[PDB]
């Protein structure tokens, strides 16, 4: 008599996602002093999203060009986008480009590039269908690295020491030790610049030490490049580490996102750059990439890649874009400098040079969970339990209140 | 004694034929309604580029599921429907397959049989295999001798399928055969599936495009819903909006009650997050704007019927001509079939006559895209079938 249970009756409700509740609490908050330091994207000094002027310009040119059609792109994506994207990462003068040993797979953001690369490695790297190769991610790292590599089938995800809580910076000796102890052929997921979530990057000299261990132990660099140019304003400096590994003779993957440096978050524009030792392997690698893409999204969308390709391939638009990127980078640099200056003017205990030594929009402040709780509950300043803030949540108008509130948290809580 | 060997040194090299709408001039056709909506979007400077929700643009998901199920669907009124925006129909199939391989018929059950039609769109096998299903099977479908549906074979394969097996069903415009069950035949299929707890995973890539009428083409999905099935429906807007390269799809989920939708979608979110994070905006924005404006919706249905009518014309003319020259065999399948694709009924090297001598290019299976026929290749295409059948 009774209706049978749903075939979904035993499907569990997934674990709540923390930051979604944080943003929801922030929007509930009636206090006019409230500040959202938990935002995950660029914001202007007026707390608004920013569509880049060059993007608006190219969108208008696209809309006014009736010759463009909607027929499927190639599985691997729009050729001009892939070429321009890889050239942006590697440099026009890259030896790997000269030697024709680079491939590029258009992907659904940086996430999609990481996923396709992980799927490839889990099938063809360090043996056939070797799911046991260790994959190392930083401690801490971007919240979806583990899930991407686990879903691609890797059974042994490990961490390398990275953030040092006491020094508020890089634990170089721990990182180097974890590299030295990593099994040969282990994969290391490396943030190319603007480490997310800490903002702490190796200096060039530290990168050389990291590369030296990886070269000697045959460790595979899987770069994640989500903030090129965005991070510092200088596209070459932000790509220095990737290019150094190339010039040291590494084979590598580089998952590139255009979500942040073009502000094209919702058009899902990414590229997986592959650097191989010999030109003949690019065709073989890409042929396997095609099979992976085919069963995932079939072929990639056009609009965002068209915008990026048009911008990177035209000198006038490229120059405008580099200025727009510098605007974003400079605002973040300003918020870092202004926050540090205020914390020091308030004689806040501890050192605060990490606020300006860190790079990009995310910063591990060094505040502890109880201090974070104070900022949220008492001061209506919303940030993650880790102490991560987005510098773009700071503004000329809120800087005094945020600095004063941090000073209160540091002196009064714990 | 080189230097370090390449980590890619052993990677193997992986191993009338259009698949998209073409005009009588053999060109792509951006739908007039799409051009109109694209201009409205371009003129709306208030639109930003911030990430969409993981599951996608809310208005798109609602409009897409309503298109499949009908505005007055009891499942919609009872709030037991979910929609996940996806990267085309392919992406919708993949997310659904990933979900089933984790949460359906047990936890992490990779052994549930997955049945696809014989023949089918080849990416069906690859999508379900990549999701981890170890046991992909076929159900009989195309009857080469009758040039139509082998209903008795299909029904027998349903009867012999283990309970809870997944069936990948083409909602309409079966690809590659163009042969669909009639409503009476669908009722027989549904009866076995209901009795044996077989899971309908519909692939709806050609709604409205197929016959010219979006409501008729969705009948089978809606019939299964009315019979109380829980089901998935992977929807593509690539063909019916001509938005191939904007990768617009939706996975519609129908459950027995609203709470199951909440839990299913929460798992969907985790799957999407590690695949593409969140979906692109442009194509979904076009579809949502069109489907939510009755004026635009009406214009769109006219654009769809224009495409279907050109295909129906090509089917009508090809058959009438092959009978005008009365080529041996029956050819009512040419007009009984529905959609862009037609299994002509020609043998694996009755084609290569068409290929090698008259250079008409088609698949070894005999599949043609009717959009490759024109008023100006009418002439010759079928005076090539006439002789391909008479000679070899």
Curated annotation (Swiss-Prot), chain A:
Q: Which reaction does it catalyse?
A: L-aspartate + 2-oxoglutarate = oxaloacetate + L-glutamate; L-cysteine + 2-oxoglutarate = 2-oxo-3-sulfanylpropanoate + L-glutamate; (2S)-2-aminobutanoate + 2-oxoglutarate = 2-oxobutanoate + L-glutamate; 3-sulfino-L-alanine + 2-oxoglutarate = 3-sulfinopyruvate + L-glutamate
In terms of superkingdom, the source organism counts as Eukaryota
* UniProt GO MF annotations: L-aspartate:2-oxoglutarate aminotransferase activity; L-cysteine transaminase activity; phosphatidylserine decarboxylase activity; pyridoxal phosphate binding
Q: Which cofactor does it need?
A: pyridoxal 5'-phosphate
Q: Which SUPFAM superfamilies would you find in this protein's record?
A: PLP-dependent transferases
Q: Where in the cell is it found?
A: Cytoplasm
Keywords (A to Z) from UniProt: Amino-acid biosynthesis, Aminotransferase, Cytoplasm, Pyridoxal phosphate, Transferase
Single GO cellular component annotation? cytosol
What processes does the entry annotate via GO biological process terms? 2-oxoglutarate metabolic process; aspartate biosynthetic process; aspartate catabolic process; aspartate metabolic process; cellular response to insulin stimulus; fatty acid homeostasis; gluconeogenesis; glutamate catabolic process to aspartate
Residues with the modification N6-(pyridoxal phosphate)lysine, per the entry, are: 260
Where L-aspartate binds, per the record, is at: 40, 142, 196, 388
Q: What class of enzyme is it?
A: transferase
* Enzyme Commission code(s) on record: 2.6.1.1, 2.6.1.3
Q: Give the Gene3D superfamilies listed for this entry.
A: Aspartate Aminotransferase, domain 1, Type I PLP-dependent aspartate aminotransferase-like (Major domain)
Q: What else is known?
A: In eukaryotes there are cytoplasmic, mitochondrial and chloroplastic isozymes.
Q: Any idea what job this protein has? A: Biosynthesis of L-glutamate from L-aspartate or L-cysteine. Important regulator of levels of glutamate, the major excitatory neurotransmitter of the vertebrate central nervous system. Acts as a scavenger of glutamate in brain neuroprotection. The aspartate aminotransferase activity is involved in hepatic glucose synthesis during development and in adipocyte glyceroneogenesis. Using L-cysteine as substrate, regulates levels of mercaptopyruvate, an important source of hydrogen sulfide. Mercaptopyruvate is converted into H(2)S via the action of 3-mercaptopyruvate sulfurtransferase (3MST).
Stated family: Belongs to the class-I pyridoxal-phosphate-dependent aminotransferase family.
On subunit structure and binding partners, the annotation says: Homodimer.
UniProt protein name:
Aspartate aminotransferase, cytoplasmic
Its lineage opens with: Eukaryota, Metazoa, Chordata, Craniata, Vertebrata
Instruction: State the encoding gene.
Output: GOT1
From Swiss-Prot, chain B:
Add the further remark from the entry. In eukaryotes there are cytoplasmic, mitochondrial and chloroplastic isozymes.
Q: Which GO terms describe its molecular function?
A: L-aspartate:2-oxoglutarate aminotransferase activity; L-cysteine transaminase activity; phosphatidylserine decarboxylase activity; pyridoxal phosphate binding
Q: Where in the cell is it found?
A: Cytoplasm
Which species?
Sus scrofa
- Which CDD domains does this chain map to? AAT_like
Q: Which cofactor does it need?
A: pyridoxal 5'-phosphate
**Domain of life the protein comes from:** Eukaryota
As its record notes, the protein acts as a catalyst of: L-aspartate + 2-oxoglutarate = oxaloacetate + L-glutamate; L-cysteine + 2-oxoglutarate = 2-oxo-3-sulfanylpropanoate + L-glutamate; (2S)-2-aminobutanoate + 2-oxoglutarate = 2-oxobutanoate + L-glutamate; 3-sulfino-L-alanine + 2-oxoglutarate = 3-sulfinopyruvate + L-glutamate
According to its UniProt record, the EC number is: 2.6.1.1, 2.6.1.3
Give the gene name.
GOT1
Q: Mark the residues carrying the PTM N6-(pyridoxal phosphate)lysine.
A: 239
Identification of the protein by name: Aspartate aminotransferase, cytoplasmic
Its subunit composition reads: Homodimer.
């Amino acid at each position: 008599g009774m209706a049978p249970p749903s075939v979904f009756a035993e499907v569990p409700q997934a674990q709540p996602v923390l930051v979604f509740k944080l943003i929801a609490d922030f929007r509930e908050d009636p206090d006019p002093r409230k500040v959202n330091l938990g935002v995950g994207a660029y914001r202007t000094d007026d707390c608004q999203p920013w569509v880049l002027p060059v993007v608006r310009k190219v969108e208008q040119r696209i809309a006014n060009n009736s010759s463009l059609n909607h027929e499927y792109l190639p599985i691997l994506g729009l050729a001009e986008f892939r070429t321009c994207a890889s050239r942006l990462a590697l440099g026009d003068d890259s030896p790997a480009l000269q030697e024709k040993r680079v491939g590029g797979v258009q992907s659904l953001g940086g996430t999609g590039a990481l996923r396709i690369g992980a799927e490839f490695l889990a099938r063809w790297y360090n043996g056939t269908n070797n799911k046991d190769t260790p994959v190392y991610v930083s401690s801490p790292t971007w919240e979806n690295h583990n899930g991407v590599f686990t879903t691609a089938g890797f059974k042994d995800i490990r961490s390398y020491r990275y953030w040092d809580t006491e020094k508020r910076g890089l634990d170089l000796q721990g990182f180097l030790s974890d590299l030295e102890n990593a099994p040969e052929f282990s994969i290391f997921v490396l943030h190319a610049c603007a480490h997310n979530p800490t903002g702490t990057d190796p200096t060039p000299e530290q990168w050389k030490q990291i590369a030296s261990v990886m070269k000697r132990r045959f460790l595979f660099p899987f770069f994640d490049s989500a903030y090129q140019g965005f991070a510092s304003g200088n596209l070459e400096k932000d790509a220095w580490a990737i290019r150094y590994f190339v010039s040291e003779g590494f084979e590598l993957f580089c998952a590139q996102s255009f979500s942040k440096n073009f502000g094209l978050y919702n058009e899902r524009v990414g590229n997986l750059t592959v650097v191989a030792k010999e030109p003949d392997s690019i065709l073989r690698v890409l042929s396997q990439m095609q099979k992976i893409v085919r069963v995932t999204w079939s072929n990639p969308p056009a609009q965002g890649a068209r915008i990026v390709a048009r911008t990177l391939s035209d000198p006038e638009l490229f120059h405008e874009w580099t200025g727009n990127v510098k605007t974003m980078a400079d605002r973040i640099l300003s918020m870092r400098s202004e926050l540090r200056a205020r914390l020091e003017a308030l004689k806040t205990p501890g050192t605060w040079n990490h606020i300006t030594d860190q790079i990009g929009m995310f910063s591990f402040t060094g505040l502890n969970p109880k201090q974070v709780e104070y900022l949220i509950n008492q001061k209506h300043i919303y940030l993650l339990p880790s102490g991560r803030i987005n510098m773009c949540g700071l503004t000329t108008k809120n800087l005094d209140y945020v600095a004063t509130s941090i000073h209160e948290a540091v002196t009064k809580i714990q």
